[PDB]
Structures are given as structure tokens and as C-alpha cells.
Design a protein around this nucleic acid. Structure first.
Ligand code: ZN
Lengths: 78, 258, 99, 146, 31, 60, 149, 248, 115
RNA sequence: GGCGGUUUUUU
């Protein structure tokens, strides 16, 4: 019974990319085959394109409730 | 699918400037030769100055700047000397540099005019333009002031610094009569006629020529005093040829490695 | 001044300008004037700069208003009425109204 | 060599085609393997490889020069006109796709390729796992008319 | 790494149409 | 040359442990309230906090 | 064949509204057989033209006789036959508009093809019978040669 | 005088902008698609009285606005009686259909009634007759791109049945949603929010217009619908945007 | 303070190659030659010589940046003629032409000097 | 390891 928009806002996308890049920089298991790159930000972008980032966004609503979305669940904008 | 056969004709040969005309060549080659005259032309000039005592009124770097601007003849020494950077020794060896010394001191009451004549060069031929017309004024000293220094002049080209710029003012002109229309005159009658204009005084500019290529490039190379004008032309042609030869050698090595 | 109708370039100038195009497909366009000599046009060279298949119409600054009503609507004598189709400049001159 | 702790076992899928498997290619097992690493093979890798090699027991299997898709395609599009009443089927192994086997046949008058996967319990075809190796081949001959 | 998943891949099945008649070979026994 | 300036954790004041001010004192540029409003409009709260805390005056 | 159009024209007026540019001018020409108007813009500089001059204008879709429909690219290194060998002024443009006097019942009887040669515009107005080979969004050539008569 | 004016302007506008920003530095769009301040007080049920970002909006004209009744009637009615014109536009396999089937005739009559209703709404909404209005998707440019891509060639009879255009527009209006929810109040708010846009969309994509001026084909129209819905969804405002600071 | 020296406009740095070749993938028989530590002098002439060669479909040099001492010459010849040999022949014929011009100039000068 | 004020300049 989720009513929030099914698209990924730019703010959420940017924050998720930065967070995944940081987790990767701290030596973490990737969720996609690396074609031959070492930039953690690029790896996070590739992971986003592949839809394999193990992160779910907890969007809060004005009342107080919150809806948990998944990078592989909601549609990506860019 | 090959190059062309350019011809040359000199119109004025003097010890200060040379006017010539190159025919059956390309505008790019003409401009390249001009830029090579202005920059890539080996020539000697003061470069490493050492001042032991300067009580003059100017600065300590002002003297070095003026000494670097002073020309030095190098008719048959620049082709022999090598670049100090490519030298295979330490300290300015006479094989790749010329030495100069200056030691002046104003004793009399009248002010002194330290000119370029005070630059006593160790070599006979490498000397400032004072052979054959006043000398280059370095500084003026008053009673009680002095100036003692020793300088070394090396080989270089204009691309590095303006001191090694032999050509004073290269005048290059192609197509006097705006025939190729490379320059559109809003009012042709208001512009004068070029020095090399063969058009009569009635018509303002020659008519249009569609199947017309830029040819007949007029050069007027004016030498500063170091190298003769014809010597500058020959040195520039040799330098351009050497650059092309080095590029070809590098290309052959690169093709062979791949 | 480059996008005017009386702008003609030689193969040398065209190939030199094409060097400064980071999105060039690598193919030289057919010259607007094959004979008596290959002459490109300023507008023809600028067409390659427009990416994709963009379509737009714009009016030039010195565009007489009493032109669309009378004849020569789709063929302006003064070379106005910028009409870009499939990302290719056809008519008109570029100015602040278009760029 | 990819990471640490885990271990990789390389085995023979068939005649020429090999396959690597990393244990947690992902192969799950129990924790007692640390005491007798012989079990990862004596209970999973070796039985799976034997199931994969069982195709060698049937003469209908071939090599096709390491499983050349082009060769099978040309053969299938030529035999359709050379012997319409005797269209053969083939089962081969691909060198560019370990763990899979190409089952080449003609569903219709158009070219098409199909693959079958091997699993610890047996094989996998059309999304259904089979406990035996012959059961899948006997079920294909009946359910290939879809 | 250079040795990724193989069996975990989902075998995609292709679709098609062919209003054909029944004239193929029968079936064999399982024995 | 008289106007070029940079910084990478230079000296800090004594009253409010924040970067100095002035090119001579080797100080950092001021992130004005207008810059705060610009960042708010962009929506880069992480960058905003990094500028107004991380690279300003961290303290516990 | 590919000859979308071919006809002789004669010049009758140049830049009626005053010459705007310095190298291009309008050529208000009229046919001799088909009775058609032509508002061409040519390069007066390289190919000068005066009043009363006649030229054989041939709008084609390709320069080859056999008609292979070239892809469209500058390829001077081509030894194939070319229709441009017997023409003095050639240009490559793309017809961008085809207006007509259509109605809501009976078809159109008079068309007008507006083509742009990379900047230079040409309007060829006439009947809706000889302009069948003109279609919007399509490359064409000019091919015009002056007749000595 | 000019220098003094510039100085005083720079001195006053600074304080003005400072106050404007401190008044609304906290306003922002929430995930509930509603603008609120720091106290969660609703300022706008939908951002900009629409719920769309101010970046993907361009100027357009309302075709059905300020027309002459007779002009509007003859331009947005699609006469299914002139068999000659019907053959000229559509194809023979459609002229007979539009002539025989009366369900299609009733559907077009209902469409024209809806078009008249939307025109009256615009007239009572936009007094003074101002056609220039800001809307998200530029339908004219989209139709032009579709033509140039699919090579429509406006001259030959197109293959697009008016029932197809009507059902496509209806399905597209049902898809574009802002106030999600089957509740009566939710549906009423959704209709009121996307009213002007749907009115403009219908006025542009009309049976007579699509069959006379555009001549789009079936695939071209399908691509047009897809592009319109994608662009509208992209222009939807992104929750978590400081609309307050932007307006300041 | 950050003014570059004056020798970095012609002198090569340890590791930098004078000329580099890169084949393009957009069109056949196309090669870009990157020359380091050169200017328009050693580029405009080569472009003009390549243009004269009829088998060269395209030939043009550019400078990625004025402060950067580097140029890129894109060449494209017929499929039966490679850009490497095109460049080689261009440079060779240009060198021969410059030598002939120098000899002619020298003889003209020696004739003008009392002759 | 150093402060407050004023003035002058620059976008
Ligand atoms: Zn030495």
C-alpha cells in the first residue's frame, strides 16, 4: 500500500551513488562484474545501471510514516 | 602527388635587409618560412650574466636585461657552437659559448656612458654590432659609481626568448592586388595601392579570379645586425629542413615499432 | 556572419574547421556546390554541430514582419526564418534569437 | 584467487570443455568441509561432473569443434532441404559457455538454438529440475513439440 | 573475477508461433 | 601573484576554532550566508554540512 | 533514369527587391515548354549570369546514369560516369517543402517545390503533373548549364 | 545619477533577498507530493498548483482558445459525412467503417461535446483571451519530431482511425497521474490538477486535426503517446526539493 | 610564480614521444598523428602537402590548446593507400622542395652579388 | 601564533 512516487529522485540517486562509492572505497564486495575500472564512484554508477546496489531507501512522509523502496524495485530516472 | 618546383628572385640585396620573391609555392610554406625567420633561427646572445659590483642607479636585473638585448654577430660561429643544454661538459665551455667582460668606473667629473663597446669578448668574431653609428648604451654612471660583470652568450632561437630574434621586421605580402579576394574592402577606392601593385591608377583593385591560387610571395627580411639577411634566410631554410628530417626519422621509428 | 547565405568555404578550410568538432562522425558532407569548384557553405558546416535530429523554427532579428503575410513566406529574401529539420540548418541566419 | 577464504575447484564438464566452481560457479555446501575437503568433490563436484559427462555414453553426442554455433546452424538449415523426413538432432558442449549443453534441433522452419543446464540434483531444462540424467532426455523427446 | 556465476543464470526460453500439423515421430518407452 | 591564494588546513583562530582570514595570514575563503542559500536551493545538504562543519571547525 | 525534372529556363529578373547579399541573387526565371516559375539563388561570383540568359536546369536524384542511388557523401575519387560532365553549375540540396493548392474534395492542380542547397534556396512553381518526382525530405541536385543559342 | 542609482539598488536588493530567503528557506516538497514548511503546515496541496518542476516547462498556445464558434466547429468536428474528404484523408478500409458504424459516429459526437466543454472552461478560466500558457510537454514539437522520424509525407492517405486516436488519448489521460488514489476526493483532485494539460492535449490531438494537418500513422501516434507520457513523468517535481529557496 | 619555463615549448621531456599514431574506428583508412613540442610551423605545411596529394581524402592539423605544446593531424586516404605512407611521402617531398628552394636562393644570391 | 579600530582599493 505504498503511495510515494515510483521514480528515483535526483537527490536520492546522488546520495545512493555517493554512499555506494564510499562503501566500495572501504573495501566491500561489489555486486557486478568489473570490466576493468578502479574508481569507486564509477563502480557505484555501474552497479546502479545494473540494478544491484544492496540499498533500500527509507522515504519519510510528513505524518511520520515511512516507505522503504529498493533500488531494484523503483524505476530509475537517469 | 608530389611537391612543387619553387623559384626565387632577389630584388634588393643590402647589408641591412634583403627583398626577394618566391614563386610557385604554397601559402602555408611561405608563412612557415616567415615564422621560422622570426623565431627558429640560431643566433648568439648574452644569456648568463654575473655581476660582481653594480653601484649604478638602475637595478641589478636591468643590466642583465639590457645585456641580453644587445646583439652579437654570429655569421660563422652559430653553426659551430652547440646548445649549452646539449653540451657534454660542465661550466660554459668555449666550445659552446662565448665570454664577455665589463669593468667600468666613473672617475672623472663628467658622467660615463657604458656602451656595448665595453663588452670585451674573448672571441674575435663574436662581438656586438660595433665593427662597421653609435654603440648600444647600457647605463650611465656618475662619479663614484662602477660596474663589473662577466657574461656568457650561448646559442638560441626566438622561440625561447626575444633576444635570439635576428629578424628585426619581416614584411611578408602576397597578392598585392586583392585578386583572390582574401581581404574584402568595403570601399576599395579609399585604400592605397600596395608597393608591388601592378594595377594602373584608374582601377582600384584587380578583378576576381576564381581559379586562382596564392603565389608570388614578397619577403622583405630586415636583419637586426647579428646575422646578415641572406644568412638568416639560408639558416631558416636549413632549420626547417632539419625539423622535417627529425620528424621523418621519428615517424619511421614509430612505424617500425608498431 | 558565418551562417549567412553568401558564405563559401574551400575543402581546405572545411577540413580545418572539421578538426574542431568533438562529435564529428568522420564523414565529409556533400558540398553545396560541386562544380565549377567544391564550395561548402557556412550553414552546411554548422548543421553538423547540431546534435541529433532537432527541429525548430526561429525568427532573425532583421526579419520584416510584413513578410509572412505576403509571398516568400517559406523563402525569405533576407535569409531569415531559421528552419532547422533533422538537425540541419536550412534557411535563416543565427543570432541571439536562435542561440 | 579472486578473494580469500573461499576455494575454487576445476573439473571436466566433457571432452574438452572444463569448468571452474567457487565454493561459498557459486556452489553452496555444508561447514564440515573444513575437516575433510574431500567432501566438496565426493558429494557435489564429482557427481555433477559425472552427470555432465554421462552425455558421452550416448552416441548422439559430438564435439562440433568445441560447439561451433555456426556449424550447427548451417547443418540444420541444409538438412532441412537434404533430408526433410530424416532431420537429426544433436547434443553438444560449448567452449564459450561452461556448465551448459547445446541441444540443436529444428522446432520449425526457422533457425533457433536451445541450451540445457546441469545441476547437483541432475539437470535443468525449461525451468524444471530432474533427479536423473536419462529422465530429461526421455522427457524432451515427448515435450519438444510445444 | 574471471570465474563468475554459471548455473545461477536464469535460462531464458524463447517464444514463437507455428500453426503446424501433427506428423512427427512417435514416442519411446522409458523401460 | 598578489591575489592568488589557497589553503589546506592552515592556521586556526583562538576564539572560534575556524580558519583565519586574509591571504597574508594564510586564511580560507568565507562561505557566506548567500552561499548557504545557494547550496540549500541545490539540495546538497551533505556538501553543505561538509562546508559548514567538516572543513570548518569539527568538534565534540 | 532519376531525372526528377529537366527543362530550359530563361532569366527575366534578378533580385527584384534589391540585391541583399554580395555573392547570391534571385533568378526569377520562366520555362519555355512547361510554363513554370523558378526563383533560384546562385553564386553570382563564380557563375555570373545576366538577364535574357537561358540555362538547361536538371534536378536529379543522383549523378549516375545507371541510377544506383548514392548514399550521399563527398567522394571525389570516383571514376564512374557522371551526369555533371555536361553541366557548368552543380549544387546538392534537399527539397524542404512542397506547397499545393489542395482542397477538401478535389486533388491539387498546382505545386511549388522549395529546395535548399545548403543555404541557397530555389522555388520551382508550376503544374502538379511534372512535379511528381519531388518528395519532402529528399536529396537532389541542381545541374544547370547555360545555352549559347 | 546612474552610478548613485546602481549603488542604492545594490544596497537595498541585498536586504530584500536576505529577507525573502529567510522567510522560505525551509519550504520543500515532501514525498507526499505537497509543499510544507518546517512545521509540516501544508502550503500547497501540489507544488505550483500542479505538482510539476519549473525546469521542464515551455511556452505554448491553446488552439481551442479564442476561436470563432463556426471556425471551431468546422475545425474540431471531424465531418464523417463528406465521403470525398474522408477518402482523401483516411483509406478506403476506413471510410466505409466510419460511414457504416454508428458507434464511431456517436463517439466522435461525444468527443466534440467534450471539446466544446473544455473550450468553455478555458474561456471562463482564462479571461481576456490569452492563448500563451506554460505547459510541460511541447506537443507541437513532439508531433514534428514524430513526422520527421517516421517520414509521414503529408499528402498520402494515412492509416489512423479516429477511434484509435480517441482511445489513445483517453488511455494517456488515465495514465498521467498526480494524486494517486481511487477515492472520490483523490480522483477529483487529480482531474483538477491535470485539467489544463489534458485540455491542451485533447485540443492538439484531435480526429480532424490529426487526419488533416498532421497525417501521423499508427506507429507514429503510438510513439507520440509514449514520448508525451515519458516527458510528463520526467517533469514531475522531485520530492525533497527546496522550492522555497528556489522561489526566494 | 607558475610561469612555465621557455624550453618546454620545443625540448622533449623524458618519456614523451615525439610522434604518436592512433588508428580511428569511425572510418576506414584514418590515422591521427600526435606530434609533441611543435607549433603551427611544423603543421600547416604538412597539411598543405597532404592536401596536394590527390589520394588523401582528408588532411587537417589542430592544436588542442595553445598553452599545451602538441598538435594532432588527422589523415584519411584511399583504401589502397595508407596514411602512414601518405605522411612519409608528404614530408619527403616537402624536404626535397625546401632543399631545391634553398639551392635556388643561394645561386640567386651569389648571382646578385655582382652577377 | 598576536588582538581591535580606521582608512584606502578591487569585482
Ligand atoms: Zn661546453
Amino acid at each position: 500500500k505504498r503511495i510515494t512516487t515510483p521514480y528515483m529522485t535526483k537527490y536520492e540517486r546522488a546520495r545512493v551513488l555517493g554512499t555506494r562509492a564510499l562503501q566500495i572505497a572501504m573495501c566491500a564486495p561489489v555486486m557486478v562484474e568489473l570490466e576493468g575500472e578502479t574508481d569507486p564512484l564509477l563502480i557505484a554508477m555501474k552497479e546502479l545501471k545494473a540494478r544491484k546496489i544492496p540499498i533500500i531507501i527509507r522515504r519519510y512522509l510528513p505524518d511520520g510514516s515511512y516507505e522503504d523502496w529498493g533500488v531494484d524495485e523503483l524505476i530509475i530516472s537517469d | 602527388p608530389y611537391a612543387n618546383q619553387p623559384t626565387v628572385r632577389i630584388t634588393e640585396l643590402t647589408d641591412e635587409n634583403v627583398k626577394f620573391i618566391i614563386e610557385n609555392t604554397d601559402l602555408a610554406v611561405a608563412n612557415s618560412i616567415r615564422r621560422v625567420f622570426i623565431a627558429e633561427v640560431p643566433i648568439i646572445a648574452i644569456d648568463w650574466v654575473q655581476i660582481d659590483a653594480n653601484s649604478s642607479v638602475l637595478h641589478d636585473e636591468f643590466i642583465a636585461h639590457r645585456l641580453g638585448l644587445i646583439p652579437l654577430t654570429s655569421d660563422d660561429i652559430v653553426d659551430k657552437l652547440q646548445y649549452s643544454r646539449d653540451c657534454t661538459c660542465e661550466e660554459f665551455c668555449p666550445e659552446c659559448s662565448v665570454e664577455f667582460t665589463l669593468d667600468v668606473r666613473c672617475n672623472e667629473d663628467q658622467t660615463r656612458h657604458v656602451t656595448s663597446r665595453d663588452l670585451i669578448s674573448n672571441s674575435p668574431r663574436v662581438i656586438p654590432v660595433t665593427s662597421r653609428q653609435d654603440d648600444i648604451l647600457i647605463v650611465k654612471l656618475r662619479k663614484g659609481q662602477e660596474l663589473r660583470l662577466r657574461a656568457y652568450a650561448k646559442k638560441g632561437f626566438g622561440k625561447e626568448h626575444a633576444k635570439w630574434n635576428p629578424t628585426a621586421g619581416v614584411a611578408f605580402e602576397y597578392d598585392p592586388d586583392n585578386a583572390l579576394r582574401h581581404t574584402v574592402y568595403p570601399k576599395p577606392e579609399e585604400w592605397p595601392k600596395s608597393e608591388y601593385s601592378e594595377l594602373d591608377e584608374d582601377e582600384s583593385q584587380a578583378p576576381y579570379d576564381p581559379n586562382g591560387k596564392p603565389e608570388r610571395f614578397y619577403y622583405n627580411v630586415e636583419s637586426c645586425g647579428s646575422l646578415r639577411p641572406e644568412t638568416i634566410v639560408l639558416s631558416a631554410l636549413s632549420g626547417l629542413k632539419k625539423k622535417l628530417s627529425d620528424l621523418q626519422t621519428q615517424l619511421s621509428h614509430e612505424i617500425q615499432s608498431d | 556572419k558565418f551562417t549567412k547565405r553568401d558564405v563559401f568555404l574551400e575543402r581546405g578550410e572545411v577540413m580545418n574547421l572539421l578538426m574542431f568538432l568533438s562529435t564529428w562522425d568522420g564523414k565529409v558532407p556533400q558540398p553545396a556546390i560541386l562544380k565549377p569548384r567544391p564550395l561548402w557553405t557556412g550553414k552546411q558546416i554548422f548543421s553538423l554541430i547540431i546534435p541529433g535530429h532537432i527541429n525548430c523554427i526561429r525568427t532573425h532579428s532583421t526579419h520584416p514582419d510584413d513578410e509572412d503575410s505576403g509571398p516568400y513566406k517559406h523563402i525569405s529574401p533576407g535569409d531569415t526564418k531559421v528552419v532547422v529539420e533533422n538537425g540541419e540548418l536550412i534557411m535563416g541566419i543565427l543570432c541571439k534569437k536562435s542561440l | 584467487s579472486k578473494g580469500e577464504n573461499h576455494l575454487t575447484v576445476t573439473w571436466k564438464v566433457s571432452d574438452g570443455i572444463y569448468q571452474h566452481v567457487d565454493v561459498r560457479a557459486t556452489l553452496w555446501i555444508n561447514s564440515e568441509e573444513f575437516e575433510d575437503l574431500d567432501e566438496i568433490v565426493a558429494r557435489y563436484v564429482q557427481p555433477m561432473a559425472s552427470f555432465a559427462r554421462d552425455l558421452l555414453n550416448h552416441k548422439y553426442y559430438q564435439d562440433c569443434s568445441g560447439g561451433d554455433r555456426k556449424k550447427l546452424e548451417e547443418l540444420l538449415i541444409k538438412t532441412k532441404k537434404e533430408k526433410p523426413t530424416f532431420i537429426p538432432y544433436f547434443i553438444c558442449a560449448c567452449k564459450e559457455l561452461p556448465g551448459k549443453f547445446l541441444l540443436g534441433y529444428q522446432p520449425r522452419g526457422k533457425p533457433r538454438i536451445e541450451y540445457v543446464t546441469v545441476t547437483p540434483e541432475g539437470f535443468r531444462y525449461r525451468g524444471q529440475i530432474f533427479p536423473t540424467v536419462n529422465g530429461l532426455f526421455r522427457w524432451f523427446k515427448d515435450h519438444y513439440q510445444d | 573475477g574471471a570465474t563468475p556465476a554459471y548455473g545461477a543464470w536464469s535460462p531464458s526460453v524463447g517464444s514463437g508461433m507455428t500453426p503446424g500439423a501433427a506428423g512427427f515421430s512417435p514416442s519411446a518407452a522409458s523401460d | 601573484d598578489d591575489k592568488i591564494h589557497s589553503r589546506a588546513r592552515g592556521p586556526i583562530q583562538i576564539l572560534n576554532r575556524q580558519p583565519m582570514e586574509g591571504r597574508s595570514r594564510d586564511g580560507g575563503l568565507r562561505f557566506g550566508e548567500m552561499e548557504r542559500d545557494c547550496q540549500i536551493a541545490h539540495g546538497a545538504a551533505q556538501f553543505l554540512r561538509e562546508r559548514l562543519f567538516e572543513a570548518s571547525d569539527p568538534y565534540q | 533514369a532519376g531525372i526528377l525534372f529537366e527543362d530550359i529556363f530563361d532569366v527575366k529578373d534578378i533580385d527584384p527587391e534589391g540585391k541583399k547579399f554580395d555573392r547570391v541573387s534571385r533568378l526569377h526565371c520562366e520555362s519555355e515548354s512547361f510554363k513554370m516559375d523558378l526563383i533560384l539563388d546562385v553564386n553570382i561570383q563564380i557563375y555570373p549570369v545576366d538577364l535574357g540568359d537561358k540555362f538547361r536546369l536538371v534536378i536529379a536524384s543522383t549523378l549516375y546514369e545507371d541510377g544506383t542511388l548514392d548514399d550521399g557523401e563527398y567522394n571525389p575519387t570516383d571514376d564512374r560516369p557522371s551526369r555533371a560532365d555536361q553541366f557548368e553549375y552543380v549544387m546538392y540540396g534537399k527539397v524542404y517543402r512542397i506547397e499545393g493548392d489542395e482542397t477538401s474534395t478535389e486533388a491539387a492542380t498546382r505545386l511549388s517545390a522549395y529546395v535548399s542547397y545548403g543555404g541557397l534556396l530555389m522555388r520551382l512553381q508550376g503544374d502538379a503533373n511534372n512535379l511528381h518526382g519531388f518528395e519532402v525530405d529528399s536529396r537532389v541536385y541542381l545541374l544547370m548549364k547555360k545555352l549559347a543559342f | 545619477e546612474g552610478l548613485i542609482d546602481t549603488a542604492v539598488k545594490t544596497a537595498e536588493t541585498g536586504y530584500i533577498q536576505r529577507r525573502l530567503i529567510k522567510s522560505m528557506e525551509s519550504v520543500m516538497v515532501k514525498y507526499d507530493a505537497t509543499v510544507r514548511n518546517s512545521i509540516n503546515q501544508v502550503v500547497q496541496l501540489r507544488y505550483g498548483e500542479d505538482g510539476l518542476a519549473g525546469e521542464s516547462v515551455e511556452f505554448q498556445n491553446l488552439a481551442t482558445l479564442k476561436p470563432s464558434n463556426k471556425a471551431f466547429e468546422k475545425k474540431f468536428r471531424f465531418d464523417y459525412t463528406n465521403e470525398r474528404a474522408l477518402r482523401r484523408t483516411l483509406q478506403e478500409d476506413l471510410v466505409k467503417d466510419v460511414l457504416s458504424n454508428a458507434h464511431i459516429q456517436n463517439e466522435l459526437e461525444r468527443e466534440f461535446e467534450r471539446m466544446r466543454e473544455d473550450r468553455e472552461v478555458l474561456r471562463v478560466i482564462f479571461p481576456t483571451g490569452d492563448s500563451k500558457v506554460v505547459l510541460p510537454c511541447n506537443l507541437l514539437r513532439m508531433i514534428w519530431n514524430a513526422q520527421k522520424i517516421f517520414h509521414i509525407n503529408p499528402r498520402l492517405p494515412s492509416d489512423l482511425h479516429p477511434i484509435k486516436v480517441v482511445e489513445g488519448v483517453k488511455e494517456l489521460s488515465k495514465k498521467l497521474v498526480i494524486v494517486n488514489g481511487d477515492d472520490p476526493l483523490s480522483r477529483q483532485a487529480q482531474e483538477n490538477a491535470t485539467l489544463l494539460f489534458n485540455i491542451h492535449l485533447r485540443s492538439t490531438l484531435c480526429s480532424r486535426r490529426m487526419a488533416e494537418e498532421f497525417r501521423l500513422s499508427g506507429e507514429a501516434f503510438d510513439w507520440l503517446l509514449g514520448e508525451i507520457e515519458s516527458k510528463f513523468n520526467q517533469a514531475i517535481a522531485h520530492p525533497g526539493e527546496m522550492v522555497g529557496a528556489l522561489a526566494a | 610564480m607558475n610561469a612555465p619555463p621557455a624550453f618546454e615549448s620545443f625540448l622533449l621531456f623524458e618519456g614523451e614521444k615525439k610522434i604518436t599514431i592512433n588508428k580511428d574506428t569511425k572510418v576506414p583508412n584514418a590515422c591521427l598523428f600526435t606530434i609533441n613540442k611543435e607549433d603551427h610551423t611544423l603543421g600547416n605545411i604538412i597539411k598543405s602537402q597532404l592536401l596536394k596529394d590527390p589520394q588523401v581524402l582528408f588532411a587537417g592539423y589542430k592544436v588542442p590548446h595553445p598553452l599545451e605544446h602538441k598538435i594532432i593531424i588527422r589523415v584519411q586516404t584511399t583504401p589502397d593507400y595508407s596514411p602512414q605512407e601518405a605522411f612519409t611521402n608528404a614530408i619527403t617531398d616537402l624536404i626535397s622542395e625546401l632543399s631545391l628552394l634553398e639551392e635556388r636562393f643561394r645561386v640567386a644570391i651569389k648571382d646578385k652579388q655582382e652577377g
